[PDB]
Amino acid sequence: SHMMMTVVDCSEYSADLLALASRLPRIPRQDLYGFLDAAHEAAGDLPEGLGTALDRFNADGSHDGYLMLRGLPVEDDDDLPATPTSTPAPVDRPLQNMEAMLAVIGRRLGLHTGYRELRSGTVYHDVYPSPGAHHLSSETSETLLEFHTEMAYHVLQPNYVMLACSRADHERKAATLVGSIRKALPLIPEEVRARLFDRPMPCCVDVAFRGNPGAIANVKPLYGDPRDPFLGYDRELLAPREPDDVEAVAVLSKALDEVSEAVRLTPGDLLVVDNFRTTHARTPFSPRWDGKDRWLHRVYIRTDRNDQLSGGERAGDVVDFSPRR
């Protein structure tokens, strides 16, 4: 299982966190840059224990590849609106407590980033089920959302994916799976590691970025430091052609399966995924279309490393698509 340090019980911080949220702009999408500036001020006033846990994780990730915050001050279910059924969100939608947490905790880590072609270029995404969801969509439910490093094929791939839960699914069945390369690497033979490392392989892109044009990107499954590598994996989109490459990726795929951990998000939970050292998935659940379907809020965070940033960026920036080559 995950380490002790990987789960942070924030229940004791509830009143302090609500106080920070009370000073944020109530209609964030009317002025997202100013909203996130206010959240950056609040980030410096986080309770010391929570600030320290975030800073430690930010420095170089962890063996588990994620940080789970629990007990954040989510609204009671009947004080939330109905779960969204459309994207993008209305510009005048009032701020919800778990969105405020994504703002403050997100700015403690880095810069919120939107992607112009994805969900209308918005920064805050609602993750909810839809009845006709494409099999690669985070709006899936009954079909498994397969392992993916988020936007691994994108030059401006973010360091973190952050998921904040306002509603779990009714049966609390849906598991967010995290596969950490730090756990998977010991299971991969040195010979296979050597084939994977720094080797660009053809990779398709998600629907939002297709302008099916095929494998228009090149992704290195392992890269960076060979003794502590970064991971770029997508079970559906990575398309190795050479039989050795196909074989090496299959070994990596089975290793990530073997070490994957299941996180079942409940209201008030916030999951920070190290998107340079993990791949993540979501297991099946059955929506009910009753107004209370599963509802996460998702943002992407860039940090100043791995050429994510080149100068002048602000939290709230929306960037254009460029495939890794």
Q: Does 239 bind ligand RQJ (CB under 6 A)?
A: no
> Is 282 labelled as part of a ligand binding site?
no
> Is 176 labelled as part of a ligand binding site?
yes
Which residues within the stretch 149-168 sit at the binding site for ligand RQJ (CB under 6 A)? Answer: 150-151
Q: Does 206 bind ligand RQJ (CB under 6 A)?
A: yes
Site stretch for ligand RQJ (CB under 6 A), options 136-144, 165-173, 175-183, 268-276? 136-144
> Is 122 labelled as part of a ligand binding site?
no
Q: Which is nearer to ligand RQJ, 134 or 172 (CB)?
A: 134
Q: Does 169 bind ligand RQJ (CB under 6 A)?
A: no
Q: Does 199 bind ligand RQJ (CB under 6 A)?
A: no
Q: Does 137 bind ligand RQJ (CB under 6 A)?
A: yes
Residue whose C-alpha is closest to residue 231's, from 264, 211, 259: 259
Say if CB 117 and CB 33 are below 8 A apart.
no
Sheet holding 261-263, edge to edge: 145-148, 278-282, 176-180, 261-263
Q: Does 126 bind ligand RQJ (CB under 6 A)?
A: no
Per-residue CA distances from 224 to 47, 137, 198, 199, 231 (Å): 34, 29, 7, 11, 9
> Which residue reads 């969100």 in tokens?
89
Q: Does 148 bind ligand RQJ (CB under 6 A)?
A: yes
Choosing from 37, 84, 116, 136, the residue that interacts with ligand RQJ (CB under 6 A) is 136
> Which residue reads 């010391």 in tokens?
48
Query: Helices 14-22 and 97-109: crossing angle, nearest 10°?
Result: 90
Q: Is 234 helix (H, G, I), strand (E, B) or coil?
A: strand
Q: Which is nearer to ligand RQJ, 138 or 278 (CB)?
A: 138
> Is 148 labelled as part of a ligand binding site?
yes
Question: Hey, what are 146's tokens?
Answer: 């397969």
Query: Helices 48-60 and 97-109: crossing angle, nearest 10°?
Result: 50
Q: Which is nearer to ligand RQJ, 104 or 237 (CB)?
A: 237
Residue nearest to ligand RQJ (CB): 206
Site stretch for ligand RQJ (CB under 6 A), options 14-22, 58-66, 144-152, 195-203? 144-152
Query: Which residues in this chain contact ligand RQJ in the complex, by CB under 6 A?
Result: 118, 136-138, 148, 150-151, 206, 208
Which residues are annotated binding-site positions for 2-oxoglutarate?
Answer: 176, 294, 298
